Amino acid sequence: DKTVLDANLDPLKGKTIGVIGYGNQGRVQATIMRENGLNVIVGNVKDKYYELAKKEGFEVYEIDEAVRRSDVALLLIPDEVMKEVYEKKIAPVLQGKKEFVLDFASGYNVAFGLIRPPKSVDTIMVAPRMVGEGIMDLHKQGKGYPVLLGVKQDASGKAWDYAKAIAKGIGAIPGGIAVISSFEEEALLDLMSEHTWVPILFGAIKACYDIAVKEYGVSPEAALLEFYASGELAEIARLIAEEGIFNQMVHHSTTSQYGTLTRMFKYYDVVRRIVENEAKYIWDGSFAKEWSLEQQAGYPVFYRLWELATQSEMAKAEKELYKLLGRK
Amino acid sequence: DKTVLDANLDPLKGKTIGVIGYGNQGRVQATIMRENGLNVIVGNVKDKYYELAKKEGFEVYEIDEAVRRSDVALLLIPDEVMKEVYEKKIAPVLQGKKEFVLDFASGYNVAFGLIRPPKSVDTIMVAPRMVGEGIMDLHKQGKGYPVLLGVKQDASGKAWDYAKAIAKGIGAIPGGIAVISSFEEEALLDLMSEHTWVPILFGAIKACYDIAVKEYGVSPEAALLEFYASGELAEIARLIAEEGIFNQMVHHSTTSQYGTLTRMFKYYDVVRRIVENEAKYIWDGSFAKEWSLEQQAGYPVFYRLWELATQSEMAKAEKELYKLLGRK
Amino acid sequence: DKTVLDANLDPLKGKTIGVIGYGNQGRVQATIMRENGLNVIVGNVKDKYYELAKKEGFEVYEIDEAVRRSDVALLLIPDEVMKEVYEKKIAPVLQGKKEFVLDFASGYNVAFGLIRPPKSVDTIMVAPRMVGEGIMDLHKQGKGYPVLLGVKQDASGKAWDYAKAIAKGIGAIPGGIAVISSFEEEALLDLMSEHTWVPILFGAIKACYDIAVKEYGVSPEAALLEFYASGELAEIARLIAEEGIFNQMVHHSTTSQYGTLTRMFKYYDVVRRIVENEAKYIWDGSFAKEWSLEQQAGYPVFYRLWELATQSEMAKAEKELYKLLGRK
Amino acid sequence: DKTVLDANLDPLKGKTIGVIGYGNQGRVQATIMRENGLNVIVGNVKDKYYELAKKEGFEVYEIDEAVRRSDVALLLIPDEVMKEVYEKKIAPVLQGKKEFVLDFASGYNVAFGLIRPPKSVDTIMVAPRMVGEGIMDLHKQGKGYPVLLGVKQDASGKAWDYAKAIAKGIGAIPGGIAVISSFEEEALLDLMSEHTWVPILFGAIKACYDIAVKEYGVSPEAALLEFYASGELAEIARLIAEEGIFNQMVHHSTTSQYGTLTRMFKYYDVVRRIVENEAKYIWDGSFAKEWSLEQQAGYPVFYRLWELATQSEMAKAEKELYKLLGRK
Ligand SMILES: NC(=O)C1=CN([C@@H]2O[C@H](COP(=O)(O)OP(=O)(O)OC[C@H]3O[C@@H](n4cnc5c(N)ncnc54)[C@H](O)[C@@H]3O)[C@@H](O)[C@H]2O)C=CC1
Ligand SMILES: NC(=O)C1=CN([C@@H]2O[C@H](COP(=O)(O)OP(=O)(O)OC[C@H]3O[C@@H](n4cnc5c(N)ncnc54)[C@H](O)[C@@H]3O)[C@@H](O)[C@H]2O)C=CC1
Ligand SMILES: NC(=O)C1=CN([C@@H]2O[C@H](COP(=O)(O)OP(=O)(O)OC[C@H]3O[C@@H](n4cnc5c(N)ncnc54)[C@H](O)[C@@H]3O)[C@@H](O)[C@H]2O)C=CC1
Ligand SMILES: NC(=O)C1=CN([C@@H]2O[C@H](COP(=O)(O)OP(=O)(O)OC[C@H]3O[C@@H](n4cnc5c(N)ncnc54)[C@H](O)[C@@H]3O)[C@@H](O)[C@H]2O)C=CC1
Ligand SMILES: O=C(O)C1(C(=O)O)CC1
Ligand SMILES: O=C(O)C1(C(=O)O)CC1
Ligand SMILES: O=C(O)C1(C(=O)O)CC1
Ligand SMILES: O=C(O)C1(C(=O)O)CC1
Numbered sequence A, B, C, D: 001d002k003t004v005l006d007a008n009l010d011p012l013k014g015k016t017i018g019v020i021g022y023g024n025q026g027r028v029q030a031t032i033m034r035e036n037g038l039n040v041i042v043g044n045v046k047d048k049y050y051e052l053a054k055k056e057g058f059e060v061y062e063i064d065e066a067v068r069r070s071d072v073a074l075l076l077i078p079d080e081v082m083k084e085v086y087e088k089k090i091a092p093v094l095q096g097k098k099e100f101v102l103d104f105a106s107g108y109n110v111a112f113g114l115i116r117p118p119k120s121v122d123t124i125m126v127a128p129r130m131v132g133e134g135i136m137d138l139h140k141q142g143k144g145y146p147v148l149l150g151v152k153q154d155a156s157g158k159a160w161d162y163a164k165a166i167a168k169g170i171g172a173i174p175g176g177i178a179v180i181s182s183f184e185e186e187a188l189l190d191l192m193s194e195h196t197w198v199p200i201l202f203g204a205i206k207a208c209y210d211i212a213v214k215e216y217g218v219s220p221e222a223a224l225l226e227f228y229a230s231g232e233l234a235e236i237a238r239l240i241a242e243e244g245i246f247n248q249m250v251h252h253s254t255t256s257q258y259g260t261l262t263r264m265f266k267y268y269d270v271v272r273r274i275v276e277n278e279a280k281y282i283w284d285g286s287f288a289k290e291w292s293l294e295q296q297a298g299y300p301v302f303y304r305l306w307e308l309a310t311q312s313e314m315a316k317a318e319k320e321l322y323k324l325l326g327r328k
């Protein structure tokens, strides 16, 4: 199938590599690669992270100076401002090149056309799915992790070879796997989660609390303990990742199984409709517009919602309680 | 407030205690109490668990023989068959008593009237919220855990004193806390979760998979990795339990925060309606009827759904994949 | 294709066979097989049918005694009570075996999990589609008939070989055919008919009668003669089975063809919706629950409907008329 | 209650005050305060208003120069551009301070997060409800007026003391009153009016005119005279402010009272729904976004609507008429 369990490391040996940033990924992937036998450099904004990077023994020039020396570059930085940074300080230099290769962690800014490098640059993606600390939590075990790979532009007939070369250049395969997928799929997926089941889950919990309290005379403490103040969800998620989502429920009671299955097959259509709506909203590029404008206005809605959420009853009760249990 | 952080241990010292069962709770609570300085006994069906109980040094008679010797009894056994067991082998003996006390882990069978002991028995509840192994995972740390307490019938003016006595008799407070609550609240809560956000979550995930695959040319492996085959959810749940549900999201990107909050406040009404419907269905006693009948018929629906779920596309793909990653 | 026109008879020669029942199928299939050169026995409730079976020269022990002697067993008895009979008088004995094979006529009780034999028994189906008398009405002609075959559990790598062996052991192929199909498909099909076009047909006839009488001043006799008191439908059905459903209509008038076709293509969506609803109701296992409970209550609805139907106007008129025509 | 009828003047005596602007409020409040015995200064854009300010005897430096000298600052300028002005010319200087206090007239830019001063500055509000000329029209009478007060950030445990100090520093209490209220309430209120009853009123008048003319053959002049070209509304509003909204209607005829009351209680739900929608739209921060973007695009909609309104029939007729009556 489309999977790839291991591959070569030929094109990247002999070349210099440009790593932009020393955050979560940047540090991890960079240290890994240095330890994989390659000549690498770092580009960073001269601040605390720069202190830490030069600490760990990585020569760090300015961004553009690291792009002049390298024939490859990894832009391991945020998604909300990368546009301007690329426009001012990277595009000029890049125009001062002929054979180059650029790789990202996310496909947001490219899938939607906010960044359109020239045709003289092979354009690719390599994206994992962790938060970043799990990857050292796996590397010290000598394991490997899974990732997604994509190619946007090939001007060398070699983008895929560089793709798998990089893949092995970060310690994913062998030990994990590597999937090949467009920039578009990656963005679509990373967003669907952030728009569909996470917020639905949270709203459902909030509603259960509000209902139980204001309509059957229950104490906030008990509600919080049942719903999320207990680590039940965490163990469930672990068992899911280990055994399987359904096989997991065998460790539950028959009553729970019955209710859960019935209600699942009873509400599948509604959420399906919702997911359709949101995925369509995304595929078209509307959400990117919405978000970019909300940046350009001053983040008002962001502000007001962050306020409302924290000034809700549930949050205050959680505050009192977490205080009681010593939890910070 | 209604909370209780510590209390006495007076009524239970000098009396014998009857522990019915040696499963997860039974073993844990029983060993704890023995180690808390009390004279205890065990009643069990003579099978593997009986071997393990007599192994760990607990004299174990027959059930009814343990109820004749004890003035207290803890029925630490399932919720689906306990009815018959109480009718045949416990009610007679109990009628052969005057001052007795009975406590449960769950309020299902009592809140709905499937078990109505005489008026010569103080009736109570003590219910934690773990799965059971976390409690030793906390006891070896000398900590304490939270629980719920309830009283159904008082024929001694002392049910609450026995309640807190038991509470401390199992190593919850001091170290955790103890909430007081009817049998009804406990059942309502344990069920709302099993009917509202768990199945909704699962259906949403399933729908995201189905959509992404059958409508945007996406490979199954990537979908599974993004949604649940990765341990993302587990870390999120842990951070929730530690910091707070909302404060958790600070460790995410602004884009995720924005989308999540907007969509949460956008879909809150729908799930609210759903939760209303289900909670009402429960408060009335309809679900208990449904479930009892489904038992009396031969568990057909249970069977067919357990089949359909496992014969779905997502499950088969998860099978192939988990095999690849070595996960059992 | 999946069809099978003939096969072997090897595994069943040398073994003893257990036939449970001497009703329509039991007698027919048993006599056929005896005449096909096999050593067979019979198990039956000692009543009139037992008299008839021992009459026709089949040694008949008790049920369980016939299962102890046989390595195969055919449960040729009803679907509504077979559960208890299997639980009490068959499951014990079967537990007293290692290599066994069990076959049914219908898949109701198995497809829905009301009967779950051990894993040490190959489980199969062989189901024809007649009412039973047509099969002798074909055997004396040396023909063969069609059937469905299914396998639920294979503990021998041989369930299919036994399947076709049995198939030929009853005189179906060669002469007819044999289709392979799950238990589930068989039940689904046998029920869809009993829920979709039969009752719709009957209700349509009833409605035509009621309308014609109470709204255009027509005589009951004429209505009954036109609709069903005449053998028109029978000849139509015969021609359907012989030539084909559509090619049949050539023997009609052009007017009939035109009206029929137009109205058929005009009402196809409605009945489609209905059929969807009912098939879904079945696939899930709800109907089995409904029916089992209606048994457990005392067949009240059954009773009241059997009353209403017979106390309707159409039935009384049919009574008077059939009396006139000498029809019993 | 929350009201405050008079308070102290202690913290502001000995300190210098920074007044930004010399418009309606700026001039009024500044002259008042100077006349209340305080050392004050002015910051202004060097234009006509600057001429007038230096005319009236207020030393006026540049904006930032007035913020360097003052330990307090009052930003008495518009709400639509204040953002940039604060970003460029005020934030730097303010960063060059430790103990500072800032007060506004409106809470728009702060309630929605368009301006977030540091935590080393106590942030407050003092907002009246006039248009500004009424305040001298009251001061020469030695009266006092009502205002709203708010505190956004306290880094001194003294924000409220400065609040009431300022309050008395402008001649409101004693003589009027002072209410305490968040920035949020002030903005919400100032906007609800501008979105709910003003535009509804205007649309109702417009519709009455259009209807009367185009459907019962009436002359424009009469319609205009009845509806608003007469000063009826003004006298009604005055009586409202004086006596009370309802007690006002006693000076009317019984017929008017009856019709008005009935129709009021008959249409209360509709407008309630409308008001809910708009208030919700505001609380969330959507309107601020809308307005900021409409600025960033070039005020197109503003333009087109200002055109349509003036090119309507009613406006032209009003033009002809007001000309007739000599009204400019
Ligand atoms: N939890 C996470 O942060 C994960 C990030 N990703 C993706 O990788 C990218 C981020 O990777 P990380 O660096 O590990 O996360 P991060 O949030 O720590 O990235 C911050 C980095 O960007 C640099 N930076 C910040 N502001 C800058 C500015 N104004 N100008 C120039 N440089 C600036 C900083 O040097 C810093 O190293 C994102 O695009 C994301 O889609 C993928 C998986 C998880
Ligand atoms: N994950 C869990 O199992 C938790 C259980 N509870 C509640 O506690 C009760 C169950 O406690 P556990 O024993 O720890 O769970 P369990 O599922 O391990 O219960 C098995 C025990 O029940 C006894 N038993 C089982 N079948 C029996 C039968 N036919 N006849 C006589 N005795 C039989 C056995 O002695 C066995 O030890 C339930 O009511 C549940 O509501 C509360 C929190 C979590
Ligand atoms: N003729 C029909 O109505 C059709 C029957 N089938 C299927 O075959 C099976 C029945 O086969 P048949 O015997 O030919 O129909 P049947 O209605 O004549 O069944 C009566 C047989 O069941 C046995 N029996 C009845 N009550 C019993 C009891 N309380 N305890 C023990 N044994 C009892 C008797 O030995 C009797 O011979 C059904 O499951 C049906 O799904 C399939 C095609 C047509
Ligand atoms: N009738 C009104 O306009 C009232 C105003 N308010 C609130 O008070 C504030 C306005 O108060 P006023 O000064 O009396 O109204 P205003 O409209 O006369 O304010 C204009 C002032 O802002 C200065 N200014 C204008 N454009 C500038 C620019 N590009 N750069 C720097 N400075 C500029 C001018 O020097 C002028 O003094 C607003 O925030 C409003 O919410 C409250 C009650 C009524
Ligand atoms: O909600 C609960 O605590 C569970 C139960 O079976 O009672 C584990 C699912
Ligand atoms: O910000 C992202 O990209 C997250 C993801 O879905 O992987 C953490 C939320
Ligand atoms: O209904 C009838 O009798 C038919 C006719 O053509 O008249 C044969 C169909
Ligand atoms: O509309 C009018 O002129 C009023 C009347 O009573 O006629 C005063 C209200």
Ligand SMILES: [Mg+2]
Pocket (backbone or CB within 6 Å): A190, A191, A194, B253, B255, B256
């Ligand atoms: Mg994301």
Ligand SMILES: [Mg+2]
Pocket (backbone or CB within 6 Å): A129, A189, A190, A193, B226
């Ligand atoms: Mg993600």
Ligand SMILES: [Mg+2]
Pocket (backbone or CB within 6 Å): A253, A255, A256, B190, B191, B194
């Ligand atoms: Mg439960």
Ligand SMILES: [Mg+2]
Pocket (backbone or CB within 6 Å): A226, B129, B189, B190, B193
């Ligand atoms: Mg629970």
Ligand SMILES: [Mg+2]
Pocket (backbone or CB within 6 Å): C190, C191, C194
């Ligand atoms: Mg049938």
Ligand SMILES: [Mg+2]
Pocket (backbone or CB within 6 Å): C129, C189, C190, C193
């Ligand atoms: Mg049939």
Ligand SMILES: [Mg+2]
Pocket (backbone or CB within 6 Å): D190, D191, D194
């Ligand atoms: Mg305003």
Ligand SMILES: [Mg+2]
Pocket (backbone or CB within 6 Å): D129, D189, D190, D193
């Ligand atoms: Mg106003």
